Design a protein around this nucleic acid. Sequence first.
RNA 1: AACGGUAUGUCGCGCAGCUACGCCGUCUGGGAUAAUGGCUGAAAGCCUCUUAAGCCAGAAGCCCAUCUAGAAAGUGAUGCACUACGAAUAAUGGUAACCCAAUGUAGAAGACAUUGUGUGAAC
RNA 2: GGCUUGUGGCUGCUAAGAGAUCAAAUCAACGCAGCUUUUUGAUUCUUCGAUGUCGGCUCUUCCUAUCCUAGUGAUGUACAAGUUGCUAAGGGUCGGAUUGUUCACCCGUAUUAGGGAUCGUGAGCUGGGUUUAGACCGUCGUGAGCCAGGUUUGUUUUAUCC
RNA 3: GUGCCGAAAUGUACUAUCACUGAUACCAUAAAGGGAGUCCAUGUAU
Lengths: 196, 96, 52, 400
Amino acid sequence: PIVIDAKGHIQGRLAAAVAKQLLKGRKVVVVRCEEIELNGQHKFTVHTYERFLNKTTNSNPRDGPFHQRAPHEIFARAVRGMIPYKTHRGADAFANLQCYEGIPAKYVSYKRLVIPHALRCVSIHTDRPTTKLGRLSTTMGWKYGNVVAQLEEQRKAESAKYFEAKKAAQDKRAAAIEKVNKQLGAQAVKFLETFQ
Amino acid sequence: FVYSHIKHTCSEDGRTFDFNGFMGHKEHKIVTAPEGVRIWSNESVAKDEINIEGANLEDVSLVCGQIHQLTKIKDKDLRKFLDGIYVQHIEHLKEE
Amino acid sequence: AYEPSLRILAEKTNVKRSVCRKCYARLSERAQQCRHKQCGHCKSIRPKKAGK
Amino acid sequence: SHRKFNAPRRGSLGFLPRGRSHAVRGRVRSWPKDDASQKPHLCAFIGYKAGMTHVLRDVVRPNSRLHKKEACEPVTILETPPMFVVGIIGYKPTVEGLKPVTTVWASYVNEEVKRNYYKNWYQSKARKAFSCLSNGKAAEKREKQLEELQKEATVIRVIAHTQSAKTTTRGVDANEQGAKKVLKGNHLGQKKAHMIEIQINGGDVAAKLNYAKSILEKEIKVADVFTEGEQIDTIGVGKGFGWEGVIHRYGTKRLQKKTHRGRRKVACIGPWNPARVLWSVARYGQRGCHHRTEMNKRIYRIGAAKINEGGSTSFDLTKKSINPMGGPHYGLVKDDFLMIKGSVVGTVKRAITLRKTININTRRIATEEINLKWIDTASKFGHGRFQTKEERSKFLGKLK
RNA sequence: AACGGUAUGUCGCGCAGCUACGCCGUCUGGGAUAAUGGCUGAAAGCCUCUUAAGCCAGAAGCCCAUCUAGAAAGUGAUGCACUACGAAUAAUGGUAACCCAAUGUAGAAGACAUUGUGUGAAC
RNA sequence: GGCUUGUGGCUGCUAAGAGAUCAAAUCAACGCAGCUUUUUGAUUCUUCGAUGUCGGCUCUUCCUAUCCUAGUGAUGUACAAGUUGCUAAGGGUCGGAUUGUUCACCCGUAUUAGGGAUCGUGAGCUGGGUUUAGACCGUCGUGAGCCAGGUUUGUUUUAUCC
RNA sequence: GUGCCGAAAUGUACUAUCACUGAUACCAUAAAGGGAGUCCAUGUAU
């Protein structure tokens, strides 16, 4: 079960990577779905979504395509396009996905991978505007955008206290490893570091 | 305040500014500045005049533009009815 | 009566401007192009007229 | 144009689906935003719709045609017995929504509240619900939970229920200790209480848990929630009419008299394409029994109920009770009441939940002088000649 | 005669119920935009709303606030019941329900609501 | 219905002048280039073991090439009333006289746009018109008979299936 | 044909592009006419 810090990423680039490795048969959480960032100015990104809102079934709206405004189900929809989701293999694969706005209390402990070719540095040029998913959703009416920021602050304080302890462990580990290098030998230290 | 014949009343303490009776209408138009940019008037020496000053030129000159756009008249020719709050000088606070 | 000196402030903004003849849009008195994208930044501009 | 003529739409599109609500009382959608600061001050309160009169107000509007003139105005009268606080809830804010952080309960619980958790009370031998009486679990547990509400929960709401009240059986003479006691029902019938929950709009959260714990296991009255001159939203279910035709439900124009297969219908359901009936089209179905709010209902006067001086106003110096002589479909009204201006949603006997209005009027009718000259207490079956019984003997003293 | 039948009797008035030709409510502020108007400011030692970065003002329109429906969004609270920093990217059995019996707050049938030793029903 | 757009409707580019003076406030020739399927043609691909054909009545939704309402710019914009450009389709867009009418045209009002959905809508209606068999008039034909020439009387079925 | 649906390089090397926009013959439409948008550029003068 992978977890993906999806801050910094592009929506379609991540979704193309994620949707492929779902079909290979692997469970995959992503987290921080709101800090995924699309190409375009804020004007341009909103006008794309306002076209998507028009698309309703005329006889009745209830059977119409649903317009999910939360970032965690905007991203889930972009992945659903790239999987054959109507088949049994696609519906099994799509069930293995997970998106969360703000990394929740379950997945704080897990080691978080960052798939490098979907980062907005590598794929967009410099001097071209980009917007977040959270910024867009709030504009499109998501009402919990404000709440998520509050939660991040509480978490990132507690994540800082982990690292100040983890420094103190690894510093005295290096001072312990300073002693053990003399016990093995001069030439044994070369074989570990350099490889002879 | 550039006017003819109907006279313009003002009210201010420091950070804010108010309208009454511009071009004859009773409605009050109010402008709120940012922090660290002082609006003030004094009708003895200045007489029918307002003073804006502050450190940052972006925030100061925003307010002078923002005050100007409240006074725009509609469905009447601005060439004849020229009336509002127009910027006279753009000087320094204390030149040393 | 208006005050003679205080016309020159007001007539700078209102009267002394240039105007497009497709947009009809207001511009500075020395200006070559039309700012708006519609009409393709048309380059034809007159002064604003002097009615009395 | 293609329609061939222009005429507004028949019926509102925002109050769909036009079907039954199974709520017994007015379910409140959204409470007013907390000002923050100030005092918590409860908001909502239940009252039963007792009936309706009219009243002769004397009007004071500057710059209108009714300046210093009398004005007849209809008035509904909701009976409001003073309701009893029991529980207290928190609600944590999450990314999904507001989610609860446990309800604390009071020391004991009245058996009106126990009725809610059975459909068959009369069968039940054990009747074991809310067995929080055990001493070890309950006392220790609350102070744990009341600590957790300070920690997490931003919004706090107070569970509260209506007093059905107590009495003595039939021909045992009452006010005596050997007599067995039992729940009297409402003017409807019911002994089972209407439990609600009421948001407290007082700032600090912590401050609220002083107020909402002070109010706990104590009855609330109406006089310390609403005040005379308040604009109030009345929330309730309306008046059931069963199935209905297309003409009466949506208010359409009926067809020519010459129509084969009758004229009580809309003629064109729709066009050829799209090949389908639309949600927008008028159609045969349920009418009434719809849950509704209505805004900006003034309360003219607040009641209390041997003097029975409540019905009468400052003038006249004759005391008249509020109930019209002869009492229809309700009861007397020996409780706190509210003379609400105009209509209120639902039939007689219905539980209306009142609520403070979400945002404020600036209209001058909102901040008017109330001054009632005189009120009707004539009977409603059907034409009423005498306001009071006292008038009767004087008017026609000798009978048979 | 009284009190009735029949002509689905005719006329007069008529509670209740429904109903309009009657009566009450329709409050109210955001956010991002479309046109467009401005500020600072280069390109172009001048000048320009940006035709460049950045900032402001901005529609009965769009999205929120309000109001209607609502967990096969197969959810939740309460009662009973059986393996790890963060930031940028021109950076660091016994209960219970239902039947049944009324009632109406309601109803085509289902359902919903309330009560079932109590003035609940009938008088 | 489709393809096509001559014809109908709508819009550009250019200016030769009207506009007192002054081409471009507003009109716009002689020309040239487009868009539209709300007119009518052209065609014969589909339907002749049958998609019920005109108008009105009743109800819905959609388009904008905006008349009004919201916001803005120009002017031969002093005021008012106007002419005109841009963004906007949430709301509003009507009572009657004659006519089968669509359209037209008058009287009257709260100032006042035009369209689409099998020329929306007949197991929803109506049947005035169109288009049978009765009958009359007029021209034409020796005659039987004919006539986008006129007039009058003339049957509008079924849902219980998905 | 080679981001994912979808089998196969988001391949290597080299030039352009910001636009509610563009995207692979027949093919499923767009013209005359404009633009100190940007890149490349011809001839002259200072």
